[PDB]
Symmetry: D2
Subunit: 311 residues, 4 copies
Amino acid sequence: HLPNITILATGGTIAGVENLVNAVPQLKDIANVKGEQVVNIGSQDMNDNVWLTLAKKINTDCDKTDGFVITHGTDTMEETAYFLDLTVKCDKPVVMVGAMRPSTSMSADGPFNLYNAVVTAADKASANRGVLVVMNDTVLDGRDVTKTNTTDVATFKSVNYGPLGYIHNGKIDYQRTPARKHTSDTPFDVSKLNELPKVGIVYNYANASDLPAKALVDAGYDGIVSAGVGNGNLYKSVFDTLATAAKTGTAVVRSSRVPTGATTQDAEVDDAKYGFVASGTLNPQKARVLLQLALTQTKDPQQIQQIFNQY
Amino acid sequence: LPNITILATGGTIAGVENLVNAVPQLKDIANVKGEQVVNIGSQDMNDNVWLTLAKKINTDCDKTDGFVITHGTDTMEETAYFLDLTVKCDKPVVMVGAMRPSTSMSADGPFNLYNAVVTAADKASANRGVLVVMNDTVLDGRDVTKTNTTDVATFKSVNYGPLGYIHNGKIDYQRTPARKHTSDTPFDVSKLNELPKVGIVYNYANASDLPAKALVDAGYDGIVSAGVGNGNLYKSVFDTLATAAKTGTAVVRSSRVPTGATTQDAEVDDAKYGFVASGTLNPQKARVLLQLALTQTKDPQQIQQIFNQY
Amino acid sequence: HLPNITILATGGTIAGVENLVNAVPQLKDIANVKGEQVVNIGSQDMNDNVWLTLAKKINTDCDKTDGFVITHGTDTMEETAYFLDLTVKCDKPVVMVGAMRPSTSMSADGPFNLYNAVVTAADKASANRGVLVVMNDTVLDGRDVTKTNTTDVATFKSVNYGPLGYIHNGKIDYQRTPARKHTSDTPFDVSKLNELPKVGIVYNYANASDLPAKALVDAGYDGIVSAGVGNGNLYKSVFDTLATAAKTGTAVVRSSRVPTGATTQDAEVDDAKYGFVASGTLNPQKARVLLQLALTQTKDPQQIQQIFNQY
Amino acid sequence: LPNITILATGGTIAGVENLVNAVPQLKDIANVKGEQVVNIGSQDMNDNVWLTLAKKINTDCDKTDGFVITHGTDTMEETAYFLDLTVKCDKPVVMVGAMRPSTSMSADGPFNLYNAVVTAADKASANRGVLVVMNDTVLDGRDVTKTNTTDVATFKSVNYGPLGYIHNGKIDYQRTPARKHTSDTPFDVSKLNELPKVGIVYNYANASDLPAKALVDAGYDGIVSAGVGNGNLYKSVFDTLATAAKTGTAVVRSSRVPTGATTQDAEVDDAKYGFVASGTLNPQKARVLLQLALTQTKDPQQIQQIFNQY
C-alpha cells in the first residue's frame, strides 16, 4: 500500500500533468499519483485569485488524498507557500516544488525535484509542519523559505532559521519544525472570500520618490508594505506619506529590502507614535501576504502587530 | 605617517575633530583631519549629497593621501557605488559605518574606523575603486551590499567576494574589481547640479501598476524594476514599462533576489521592448548606474553597453 | 525578583570572575550573578577531565541556581557544548559564551556576548532546548553549532539546521528547537566516571599515510573517527587499517572533513560489511564526543549506529 | 571551433571517447578529444597521478587549445591546487566532476561537462590559473573547496569568491587570483618521480600526540596541523611538532576551521618555534604547497615566504 498523492499544477511541466508518472516513472515506487491542472500561468503573474483557488481546493479535497504536491514557478513560490501556510486547514503534507532549469535542458532539475517533493508529501513525518517547499534535496518551511539567487538550482534557502530536513536516498531526517503558528492554528479562513484586501509594496533607496506610496494611497489601498533600508527605515518623503496614510486608515507595515534579519520594533522608528507595524523576519512580499490576511480580521495596528508576532 | 581625511556625513561612529580622541590608536597609523560634510541619517541620503561628496573628493585629492567617509549603513552600498563611478582621485577612498551605536556595549564603530584608516593608508589600496571596510574586510563598492538588518557582519560582496581581509593592521589583497571604475569611467559630475530622475518599482504577486504609472506620469527619465526571479515582471507592471520605453523612458530590469545576475537572453526579449538587463546590480545599485548613464545617453543599446562595462 | 545565574569560568576573562558584574555592570539589570572559576585554560587544551568536571558541577548545582553561563575559549567551544548537551541532566538553561577579540582590544565582543548569554540563561523560554551557545546576538544549539571562520566575530553558526533564535534589545524570538535527543532524554550518565573511552581522529586527503590510524590502533584506542573526504570516504591505506581495526574491537565512525552536510549510511561505503558507523551531520570532533559516550554504553556497531541516529 | 582535450581520471560523469555522444551539444562548441589518464576514485588520489597529470598537460600544451580534466569531487580541490602550481601551460585547464551519478535522475555531470568545455574554450579563461567549473560557476584552484557532502552546489571559493558565472554558454569574468600560479611559480615537477612526504594531523580536545609522533618517527619531511581556531594546537601535539621542527621537520599550522586565514602574529610565535602559518590554505591545500616548497627548501623562513606568495 502506497500513499495517494495529488499533484496540483499551476503552470508548465517541470519534468518531461497526467503524464508525469511517465516522465518520472519512479514515482510509481513511492506513491499513487493523480494530477490536476488548476491553472496554467507563469509565476511572475501569480495573483490573489490563484491563491484563493489553491487554498479552497486543498481544504475541500483534504479527505480525498494523503498529501499534496503543487508544481509552481520559482519566481513567486515563496509567496504562494506562505499564503497557503496561513490558510490551508488540511494538516496532511502540502509540498510545493519547481525547477530552475527548463525540463528540456541539460541536467534539468525538475525530475528529481518532483520525485523528492512526492517523497516528502508521502512521509508521515511531514505532517503538521505547515506548508513546505522542497528544492535541491531540502525540505523548507513556507514562512522562511526565499529565493536567494536568480539562476542557481540551490537558490531556495530558509535564510533566517534554516531548513527542516534533508532528503537522501528517499528518506528525510527532520530535525526542525516551525514554531510560528500555521495552517489549522491560524484564524485566517478564506473559504468564502472571492477577493483579498489590497496591499502594495514600495521600495526605499536614496532620493526615493513618494509617488509610488501616494499612488497606492490615492487608490484606497487597504495596506502598504515598505521595503525599508536597513532595519526597516524609510526615506523622508516616503515616511511622510506613510505617516499620513496610517492616520487615515491605511495599515502600514515596515519590512526591509535587506535579505536576512528582522525588522524589529524597538529601533529607529517609533511605531506606536506613527501607528506602524514591524514585520520581523518577513521580507516585503511575505509581509504583504500576512498583512492581506490580517486585514480580513482587523484594521487596528496593535492587533496587526500581534498577528505579526504570532504567525 | 600618511595624511588621511575623514569626511563625515552623519553622527559619530566611535565632533568629527574628536575621533583621534575616541580612537587614540589612529595617531599611530595616520595624521587624521576631519571635516563634517553633511549630518543626516543615511536613510535620507540623496543626489545632492552624492554630488557634494564626489566634487569634494575630486577637488581635495591633491591635498591628502587618502579619504575615509563615515556614513550610515542603510544606504552605504549606494553611495559607495556612486562614488566608485564618479571619483577620479585614484588615492584610496574608503567608506565605513557601524551597526551598533557608539554608546552601546561592544560598539563596532571604533575598530571599524581604525581598519578603514588602515585601508586608506595602505598604498596597495589604490587603484581598486571606492571601497567599503566593515568587519575586518575590504569590499569593493560595486558588489558590496547590506545582507542583514542587525548583524555587525552584514556587509558582504555577495557575488564575487571581498578584495582582502585585515589582520593586525595589515591587508592581504587577493582580488580587485574588473569592472571599470573611477578614472576609467566617462561619468563626470563636476559641473552637474542635479541627476536624472530614476525610480524603483517592486514586483510581487498581484502587483499594482500604479507605482510605475506614477513615475511615468511624473516624466521620470528612468525606472528600475525590482523583478522576480531573473528580472521578470508582473504583467501589469510589464505592460506599463513597455509602453513607457516606447516613449523614451529608460527601463532597467533588476531583481529583488539578493544574489545573482539579471541576465540577457532569459525570459524577457530586452531588445524587442527596449529594456536593459542589470546583471549583478541590485535595484538600488542599478539606479545609480542608470542615473549616470542618462547623463550621457538615452539610447537603450548604449545603456546596455554601459551596464556591461561598469 | 531577578533570576539567579551562575557563571562558570574555564579560562581568562572575556570582559574587562567575581569582577564581571563590575566589568559588565548592566548584568545587574537582568540577573543576580555569581561567578566560580572552575578551571583556567586555553580551550585549545580542553580535555576529558574538564568536561567531566563541568557536567558533574552543573548536575550537582542545578537546584541551587536558575541557569548557567559557561565562559570558554572559542577554539573548542563546539565540542564542550555538545558534550554537555549529552550529559547535563539539568533542564534549566545552560549557555556557553566566548569572545573572538581580546577584552582589551578595540570593539571587544566579550562584554555584549556575556550580557546576551545572561539574557539567554535568564529567559524561561530557553529551558528544555539543550545546551546552548550564544554568540553574535544569536542562540545556537550545542549539536549543530560550529566555528566557521578563524577570526570573525560572527564565526559561530549552526551550519546545517540554523539558529534557534535571535536576540534584540534583550529579548529572544525563538522559532526553533533541536529535535535530536539531549540532556535528560539521553542515557549518558557521567556522574561516577573519572575517565572517558579513548577516541582519536584521523584526517583523509590525497596520498594519506596510514600511520596515524595505525598509531591509535597500536595504542588500543576504543574508537577512531575518520575525517573522510566527501561523503565520508577514506583513502585506500586508511580504509585498510580501519577495516582491520573494526573487526578487532575498535569502533570506527566515518565523518567528513567537509564542513556541512551529513556523512550518510547508503553511499559508497558498505558500513554493514565493514562494521563502520556513519556520523550524519556530526563533524569529526562532534562525532568523537558522541562516540566516546556511546562507548560508555556499548561496543556493538549496530547499537552505536542507532545512537548516532538518535542523539 | 577550438580543440579541447578531455583528460579523464575516473568513471564517466555523463568510454571517455563517448562523451560527445553523451553530451552531443559539445560538438557545437568544441572539437573534443578524450584520453583516459587513470581510472580511480578520487578518494584514492595520490602523488603519482598528480605528477602524471602535470607532465601530460605540460607536454601536450602545444597540441591543443585547452584542457578539461574529469575528476572525482572528493579531492578535486587538492588536485586543482597542485596543477595550479605546477602546470606551465597558460592555455585554460579546467577541472570538473559531478555530485550525482551519471545514471541518476537529474544528473549534474552533463551540464557540468558542457560548462567546463565552454570555460576551456573561452579565450578569457587563459592566464587565470587552473580552474574548477561546477554549478555554473568558474572557481580558482587555490580557494575552491568542497563545502557540503552531497549538494550539487558544494564547490565554493569560500574566502575570496568565484571568478565568473556562466549563463547561456557565456562567462562574465569579474575577478582573477592575485596569488602567483602556473608559469609564475618556480615549482617544476617535470623530472620528479616522487614528492616530499607531508602528512596531516587533526586537533581537537584531548588530542593524542601519537599521530604526529608516528609521522615524525617515519621521517616525514613536513607535517600540516589542522589546528583549532586560528591554527592553535593541543598541547601534546604542539610539543611533538616543536621538537620535530628543531630537528628539521617542516611544520605548517593550518586550521580545521573551514574559512579564514591561519595568521602570523596571533597566539603562536611561529618564528620562535620554526613553524609556518598557512594563511587561507586549508590543511589539504597547505599540504600541496608544503610538498612543493620542500622540493626547493627546508628553511622555515623561506617556506613562510612561499606561503605568502603562492
